[PDB]
Amino acid sequence: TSWRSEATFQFTVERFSRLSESVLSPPCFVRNLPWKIMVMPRFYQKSVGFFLQCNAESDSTSWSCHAQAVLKIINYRDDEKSFSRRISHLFFHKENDWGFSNFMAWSEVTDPEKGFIDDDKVTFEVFVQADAPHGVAW
């Protein structure tokens, strides 16, 4: 159920090579809160920005939830070549997302020989393990 303490969810970004604005997945409910994948191009050389967002729409300022997560870009040819990074973060209203602005090089993820992109689609996955929240279910 939505009260579960962990879940894995995926979001496939289409027309990936043409991405310009941040894109957001539908919510996955864990600890009864909505978690989402956020992806955007970033520049510093171009990189994939990949973030996990928690409970961002709520106007509450009382809530918090600590979670650990694995953020993964799927390699569709060989899951052993999928690329992942781990985070731990206390999510709350003023810091409702966390991840990596330079998760991977854009030129690598979009390289058709590497196995992450197919039909201009790239799939992102999050495994999130969340603690019981505070300041929500009183």
Binding site: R42, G49, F51, Q53, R85, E95, W98, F100, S101, F103
Partner: peptide, 8 residues
């Protein structure tokens, strides 16, 4: 660096 942190 992988740029760990918030999106904004």
């Amino acid at each position: 660096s992988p740029g760990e942190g918030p999106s904004g």
